[PDB]
RNA sequence: UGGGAGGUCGUCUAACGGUAGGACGGCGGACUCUGGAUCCGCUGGUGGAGGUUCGAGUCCUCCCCUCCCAGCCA
């Protein structure tokens, strides 16, 4: 509250493809032994030239858009000249100057009051292989292994404004982005297998602000759990700063995930010159207008909005749509469902309760599973003829949730139909009070549900049949002359 | 008919039995002729032609940084020899996906990059007629073992006019497709933005018919989508009614006398079959390669940024990283080379970009912008290939000579621009030609100014040029 | 525009080397190459778009399939020097029946301390589930922690469940055919199984700092020969593959897990001992164990020991975590703890077959009579009935069950069992009448709980010199009308013919009658002085099994006690 | 923080979706003798907010408490 923090982050995505970046080998290479997945061009060979991946492209703007990011028509590729054996062409195929999408926003449950978060640039990337050092991680030996199998592997490095306050804004901006993208269909997401990585900036002075601080960066720390409690402590030792005399300065720090602490710099792969020059190789990439309102069409509804629209667009509550809307292959086994019998209203409560219940007492989801809306519509229209109380109709439901036998089906057999016929209702609950008057006493003075056990007598008698509301008229009444 | 000397038109059709002899009595040939001329790294074993393909049998010879399966590629370079091959060279894979056997692979200077040929770093190659003169160019032992006949036609790069040098300089047809129309992969790429596979051969018809072989897209170059192009048909109807252009610095060096004098007959020798040989003034035009030394060495210094003892090639056993690269970097790519992947990482330094590159970059489509329009008030621009005879085996020690001594050809490169060297001189007794520029991207008509020449000129008996007899 | 530092910026840019030789050579016509550029100088300094390609500026991007190398191999062995398929580079008409695999539980303590209520349920589990469905309990020390750990603890360990009356068929004290049963005796097999994993691809060795065995140093899958003997330490880790591990669980049901969630785990320590987690497997595989039932506080435990399994190639047990006994505190008990240790209940006077009673009961399906023997209940055990949330331990309902219980057995046993009792505890009883004692125990029973109250009441019945409780005195005998009544009491008795139990409560039935105080205030009197205690049996029994001659005594021996 | 498992009187344990009971503790009594024995009566609970239902401890969503694994502890 007393001292104010601005964190900004940089991130890299693996995105979930299938040819790799520049070429035609698989990107999807993880459990594949060292060097399967080359090919003449990724791995750097002489006389090897890239050819851009559509699929790449596709990725890249649906995940532009949904970060509500200003695209951009033209869009260049650049090298970025480097040394490193797990780097084959000696350069990487970036975007530096002309981000196929510029600036951009996304919007934070915020674990802090309802946030948005300004995006900066959203380029691609071409993305090295792995080095392995003599049996070690942050250090050294003898030598070190090259496996180019993910030489060439689409990424997407969004960098973000120094919007995020909270350690915690951070995890959520991230946890966003991972439940987002896990979406659309564009990357798992999931830091641990180095699908989502990330480094950050931090600062503060005052209480109110004039500008920031410089920043101090936090390369390396996969895991969520591990970038807050992280950026966490690379907070509690900024404090001790101008509180100790202190400015906030330049520097690179690591973190080790063993101890719970942050280091320096010792590697020293600097902040060098890195010549951005554009990719002779490749020309230009021009997104047709006359194809890109094409693919608006083919990204998928945020659940967000899939509910907005259920919401007022279906007379489902704000709740109820919000609930349906999670599971997004339930989400549209409502609609599938609603088609064929349009009536919203009822549909909802029963995927919400019983059905999404079935869907956990065995772990399924709808997906699979011999339920389709001709069933409801067959329930439905049968307890809209009352040959079925809302009970029976709850009492059949897992049979036909098992046996995918039709509702109105297995009551053909055990023979279910609400006999609320003749008020022999009215007989049976009679002598329900002759063979039980410590109970009609108790009604003569217990009113809250005392009949309730009545109730209950009269359906234990009839199998669930009866017919509520009739049941409970008539008792309510000859517990009037005891 | 001696086989030293053998159009592939004439190859064509000479028996099933009379002309399966001619791979063999090639690499025989060979044997012979090249200890001699000394242009080839590999020369094949001793493997053979079948049938398949209207131009079978015809024995090829190709410029050693085009990737061939089979046979290493080398770029004649210390650092990158003793590499295998992993995939044929789309153009080599359309070459003998039509017939054509390739024999062996030949030299060049050290990654392409110069204009002589002796600074191959694997030894000098000498001109046919003069084994005191030099091939010239970049791909000069190609455009020296045509001429000399050991065999019919070849490839090779041309980055600063490195298939037109070498065939003016060492007396044959070479051509320089426009950047857009054969595939650069396979092609060890020097400058991306300039390079190009062209052919080199004895008649200005089969640097005609070599391209409707050798081209086409290639979705393994991003950089060659399609154009309706006609290298033939058109190919024998002089020029009879076509207006020109020429240079104006052209004359302001100091052209060695033989040659602008046995080339102002190109002048007449066109005007008498009747077109005019008018002339206008570009300015920017001046500086070319001045601006193509900034761009391509830049381009090289990450080009070549891949040759680093990391994965295949050359490799010092040293026991540090920031050792191995560096003295393995040093120790293999050596001589020329060095200093333009130098000159070429200092034009794109910290505080240089914008100065140096962007600028040449710019001025790439200054120069661009004026040669093309050129293009379109009338046809063909030209210009002598060659500025010089052919110079004698040793060389004033001195690169900047070399970096001029094209001018010539290098502005093509900077649009792609087609651009021959067809054969009509002797002069100072080593055969220069003439160079005949064409509208970016507009080929065929480049393919009938030059039969044009080669026929309609003094000197070509039968049609074509003569070829130098050579010591066997 | 000429310079010589312009080496480093440059020749360390493109990682180029230049002999003290080629050195100042390649400047001279570098200074030349540089000036003759200057010849650009004049130009347009504003708006010109560049140009980096010719053409006509698209793309056209490749849809096609992912496709592997047609000849890779060609990339491969071309590499200048490679290991494990990486590159390698410079560092910086007869037949037979079918046999099913027999029953055979575990309870494997680790002798870290006290066996406390908890183990004994959890044991008594195991034992009870071997003991229905006919198999065999095994019995396991396991002791890997060098520190933690006794043969003290270990020797307890075995008395305490000894007297639950829970009989191992094998143990570390009469061997069995999967011996030995301690684990700091079988160091000969896990190093041996430990590195029948790093032979394989599966775990693999790690050396530390000389002086400090915290930082990590290296690591490849072969033994670190000279750094042994140089004296480093080495662990070996087991190699977690990504995946998803999960099992069955009787009690828990279906259990899933994935493995981005366990790091690379130590499964051999410095000094030679296994990890709690690869110790088990190796012994719970050997020593063929069908069924294992444990603690709830292992479950997060089953997949670690699943990835072993599953890499020895090892078919696992069924699994069955049961959950804990908490203290008062919504926790579990413990060797830390250690106020709920077995040893203290039994010398505390409660009777095994009631622990074992109650052990059999906190949280189980109560089903019919509470009170039961642990025979009784077997026949009818599931070991479904079990609850599944971890109950708290109340001693309260322990003493209720454990006194329903002496009340209701034959006497001779409570006699043994107190007896027994007697010395354990060390109480020291002098013995005397081998059927007087015989009834005063009859009559003590019926009024106590545990045992250290069927001593303190059986008290005043031997010991002659038994106090009087300073709160007997403070409402009795500081009363005004004591000696009064223990008099007339004294004389009342002194003079009685028949000391039966017919005519002596009459005897009473009176002195009452006679108001020297309230049938109350005397009762407790008469009590009161003859044993000392407010509460005691029957005053009618008491005062019947104690003779003429010690009431007469006792009546007077407070008389005097009175004084002053 | 993740992953796991639990959550009905003070403590355990019950209630086809139909009056939330039983046991132990506790409080009050009774037993023409105490009570730490025995009997008897009472007290006292579904963690919270909503949803489905005529009816919810039981079915659905979210939230809250507790415990476990995250060990060169087991
Ligand atoms: N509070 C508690 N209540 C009720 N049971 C408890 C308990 N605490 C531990 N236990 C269970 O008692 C058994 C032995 O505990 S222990 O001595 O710590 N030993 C061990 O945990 C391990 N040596 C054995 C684990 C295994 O079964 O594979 C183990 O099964 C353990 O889970
Ligand atoms: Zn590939």
Redesign the pocket.
Known sequence: MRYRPVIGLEIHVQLSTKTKAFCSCPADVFELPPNTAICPVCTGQPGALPVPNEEMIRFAVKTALALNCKIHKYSRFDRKNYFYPDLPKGYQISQYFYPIATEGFLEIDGDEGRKKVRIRRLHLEEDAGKLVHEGDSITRASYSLVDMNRCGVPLIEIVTEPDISSPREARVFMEKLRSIVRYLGVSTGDMEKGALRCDANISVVDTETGRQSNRVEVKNMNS??FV?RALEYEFERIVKAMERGEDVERETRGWDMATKITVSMRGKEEESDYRYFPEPDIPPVVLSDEYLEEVKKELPELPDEKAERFMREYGLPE??AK?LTSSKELAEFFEECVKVVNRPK?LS?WI???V??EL??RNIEITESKLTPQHFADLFKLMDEGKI???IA?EIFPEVFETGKMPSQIVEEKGLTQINDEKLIEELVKKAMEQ?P??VQ?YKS?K???A??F???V??ETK?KAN??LT?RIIQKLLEGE | LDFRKLTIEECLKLSEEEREKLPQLSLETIKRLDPHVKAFISVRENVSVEKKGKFWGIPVAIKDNILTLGMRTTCASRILENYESVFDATVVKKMKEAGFVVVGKANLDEFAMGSSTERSAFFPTRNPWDLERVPGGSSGGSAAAVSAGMVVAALGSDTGGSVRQPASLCGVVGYKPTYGLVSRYGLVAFASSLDQIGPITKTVRDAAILMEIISGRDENDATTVNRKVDFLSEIEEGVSGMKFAVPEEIYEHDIEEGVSERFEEALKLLERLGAKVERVKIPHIKYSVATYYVIAPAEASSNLARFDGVKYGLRIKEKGLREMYMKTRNVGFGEEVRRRIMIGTFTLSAAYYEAYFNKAMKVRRKISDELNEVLSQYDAILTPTSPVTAFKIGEIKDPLTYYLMDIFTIPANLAGLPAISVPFGFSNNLPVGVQVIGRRFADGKVFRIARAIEKNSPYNENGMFPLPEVKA | KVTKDLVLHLENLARLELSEDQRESLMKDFQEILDYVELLNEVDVEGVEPMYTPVEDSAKLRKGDPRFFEMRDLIKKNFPEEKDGHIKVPGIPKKIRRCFELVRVRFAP?P?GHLHVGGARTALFNWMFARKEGGKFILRI?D??TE?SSREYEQQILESLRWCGLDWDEGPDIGGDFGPYRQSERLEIYREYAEKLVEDKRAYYVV?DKED?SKELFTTYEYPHEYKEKGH?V?IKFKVLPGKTSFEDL???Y?E?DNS?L?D??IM???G?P???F?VVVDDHLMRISHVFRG??????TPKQLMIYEAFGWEAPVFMHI??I?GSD???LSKRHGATSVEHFRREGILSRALMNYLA??????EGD?IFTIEEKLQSFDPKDI??????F?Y??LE?VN??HM?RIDLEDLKREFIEWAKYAGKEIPSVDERYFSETLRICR????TLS?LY??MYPFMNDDYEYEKDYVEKFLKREEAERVLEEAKKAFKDLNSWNMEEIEKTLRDLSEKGLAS??VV??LI?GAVTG????????ETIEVLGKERTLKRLERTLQFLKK
Request: glycine fraction near 8%.
């Open positions: 969520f759990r807050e709740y109820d609930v009822d409560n919400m309760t019983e999404l219940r956990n007492e109380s809302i009970k709850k039980n410590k109970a108790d217990g809250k549900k005392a309730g056990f109730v209950g007598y359906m234990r669930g509520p509301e409970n | 680790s870290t396991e890997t922690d933690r530390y065995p330490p662990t009690l828990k049901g259990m897990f969630t790091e785990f130590i320590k410095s000094n001992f990890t709690y987690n110790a709830e506080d292992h479950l997060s435990n959950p804990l908490l919504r926790t579990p009961l906190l949280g189980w399906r109560v509470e609850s599944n949330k971890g109950v708290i109340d309260q309902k209720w006194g329903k009340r019926e009024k106590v709980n109250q303190d009441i049938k109350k009762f407790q009590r205690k407010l509460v005691t049996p029957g005053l009618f």
